[PDB]
Amino acid sequence: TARQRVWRAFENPHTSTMALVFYYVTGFFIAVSVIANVVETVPCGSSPGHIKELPCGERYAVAFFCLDTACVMIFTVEYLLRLAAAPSRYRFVRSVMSIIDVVAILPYYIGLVMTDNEDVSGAFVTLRVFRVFRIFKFSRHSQGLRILGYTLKSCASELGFLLFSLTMAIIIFATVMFYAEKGSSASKFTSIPAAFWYTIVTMTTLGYGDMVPKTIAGKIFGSICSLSGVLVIALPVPVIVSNFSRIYHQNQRADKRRA
Amino acid sequence: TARQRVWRAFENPHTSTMALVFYYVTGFFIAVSVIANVVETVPCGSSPGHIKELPCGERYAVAFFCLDTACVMIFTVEYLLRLAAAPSRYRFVRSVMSIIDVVAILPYYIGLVMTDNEDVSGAFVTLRVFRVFRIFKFSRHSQGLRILGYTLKSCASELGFLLFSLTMAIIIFATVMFYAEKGSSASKFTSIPAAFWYTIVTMTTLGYGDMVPKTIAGKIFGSICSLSGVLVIALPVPVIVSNFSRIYHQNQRADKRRA
Amino acid sequence: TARQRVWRAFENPHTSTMALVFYYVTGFFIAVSVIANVVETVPCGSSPGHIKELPCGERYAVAFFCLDTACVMIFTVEYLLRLAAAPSRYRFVRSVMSIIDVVAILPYYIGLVMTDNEDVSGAFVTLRVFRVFRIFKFSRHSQGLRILGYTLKSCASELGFLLFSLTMAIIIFATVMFYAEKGSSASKFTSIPAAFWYTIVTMTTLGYGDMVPKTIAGKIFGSICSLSGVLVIALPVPVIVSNFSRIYHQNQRADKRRA
């Protein structure tokens, strides 16, 4: 019953006090790792002796590395405890939580095994990006988040086809804007993929203003694009809200069945 | 029964396997033509021997022309098969799908017959714009798109009058903004059609920022315009959503009648 | 029965053919006057002999004046016919439609009586602004517009208090943004009324970008302002939509009572 006791402790933390305190320690270390990742990029100061303003992750590289390795050790010990104390280890490994944990902890091990090629450029940037995934471990630390996830999975097809319609609208508007605006002086509409940016910024009603039409036809089609974006701000809400509310009522009915 | 067999194959592709595979080939060629049209405008590179960075559609003009003519041949053979194997050929020709197909394939034939006047300027740009219509042939490759089309046709009058009210609001706000802002130094509000752009960008809550008021009265009326745009982002949703939901329930009731 | 016959012709145009054709002529002249007012500000061309690009309303001043006086004559004859053929003339004069008609036609008569002081500056600009009100005469040429007007009148108190809450939010955010951003170099936050513009542009999710915070505290409070604007885009919709739908159902019930 040891393995099942440990798995019961992990899966439902509130069942015990030791399990719940280990849960809170794990959540605290997740927050520490996220805050350290965010903070290590802040330029701390001039650091006299160096002209460039070094980030906190380079002026204090050893301290941040110690914090990161403590967090990664905690995460990997937790992962090994979960995997070795699961009713079905393969089912655990294939699960979304497990792959998130592995892809969160694994960049640290690549950085360890790339210590010989310390002059790596670009790949380590992708590894540090993938280190953002440690925030997703807060999914175990919420309940409405899983409700939203189930709602999204139930709206996967509808939202996918809505995105497909949005994509064809993007292509149409980008084509017309590129052809209407390719002739302007020093125009940013240098291609249709270049007008993808303008179209996606216009139909979301951002309007950064870096790419704006400068021709009469371009302005007319930009106005049509804006009006289409007004409807874009209302096309996903009905399906999403209706599906979420249906799930809400169904969950309440399940609760009353259990009661 | 040959003509009716071919028309049954075309209209409902899933009835057979040959019809469905020809359907998927046609959809694949539609996607190929759309991607080629989007890509041919991307500047591929310096192309040594030419100072200007030529687009992919001009450095590799022969390859893109071969791809385009293969796609157009497939489309026109499909169109002839559909027209010659229809229960009512005139009804086919007048249909929206047929006119979309014709206006998609016809710019290629104009480009063929304009090969003598290869120095054409402007008209060929419009032809290449109208080549975007090949994306619309994906309408046959969706089911919710037709539901949205029927909903739009049922909301044609309501949305038309809503657009008319939006237009009168645009005219009013453009007039007041032009008269409040015509006196500024190097102002972009050079006319009321010039303020149409500012009004349509403001009431959609884009705010590009190229045209902003610089006078106190201009800023007051721009604030009123912004507040009106807040309501603009909510005026089409009730009619559109209510009509679409009514169509949804009516379709479900039709399904249950058939069941 | 002459006066009542004329008033029946005016009030319900569809009752006859002469009344309906006079209605359509009046609507056509309203559209002509609106289009002429919009077009007279467009710079037509260089007009050789003058360096400045004169607007259409000044290069062709006599033609636009003739069109304007024809439109004003039609409008004032219509107004006199309505007033002299009304069941209660005072009730007509106090009505909103009558005041709109008078304030639309009256700037022309001021321009006539100000022909001696043709060098007027500023006041004539306000008169030309008030000439925009001729668009509002399209209210008689719609039915859903009156439904929206009744809905607005029924939501007058709720929308007024919502605007009051929006105003107190504007004042709070403008105060905090001004005090956080008054110290920046060449800052646009020169006063709290100056930050009114930033606050109203931010809580409507325009983001023109002319006034942006440049301090950390300013950016924090701008983020709070943006998040508040997200709720601003949803605070008027429930009251407006609920009231409009209640009016819709009540009108349908009235129709069924009459049936």
Next chain:
Amino acid sequence: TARQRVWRAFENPHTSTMALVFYYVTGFFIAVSVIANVVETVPCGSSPGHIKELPCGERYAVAFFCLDTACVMIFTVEYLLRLAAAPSRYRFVRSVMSIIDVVAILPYYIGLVMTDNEDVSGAFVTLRVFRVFRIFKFSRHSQGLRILGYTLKSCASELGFLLFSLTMAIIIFATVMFYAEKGSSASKFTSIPAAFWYTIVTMTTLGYGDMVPKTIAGKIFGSICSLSGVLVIALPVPVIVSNFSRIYHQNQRADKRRA
């Protein structure tokens, strides 16, 4: 019965005429103080003899100080009357209205006791900011505002977790945008807290345009951020509206129970 008479006069102003007129005087002085605070920052003019354009609160410092001290005297006399004539003085002091009143009136007394250190910098700015809280005393002068406050208190947990999800989305998008855009020339994405601003401006569909991506990966992730903001403009509305409507129906049912 004196204390209870005074407290009944304060709590429900409409019970009497003296209580209601004192209520209206208090509201008028609140509006006077708010308008004076807003106006004292407006640059009145050149004020010959001084090169800088002094604000109204410094060219006319004595008049604004007299107005402010009259308003503060009225507010503190009202506060003492409320506290000394309350059924439970401690319950009054701990109440939200009381702390708002105290923090509104108290900056004036700090300014009095800091008259020796008149060269204070920064702290007095915070005091003048906290003087904005006098607007909140209009909470006693509304009824729907308390309905919104109760609705917010009932949605405190749901909106808090929604803000937490928005925060994790902000962190993820800021990380990816910083790492995609840190390499650009003179990029504003100098850190992840620096990209917090871009992310919060993008997911609210502001698009100021001061920080825009300049790399292909940055533009792709900015497009994803924009699409997420489209859903952000719809995630708080269902919970807020449903809770507010439930409170509405419950209040109507309470009214009918009392009837």
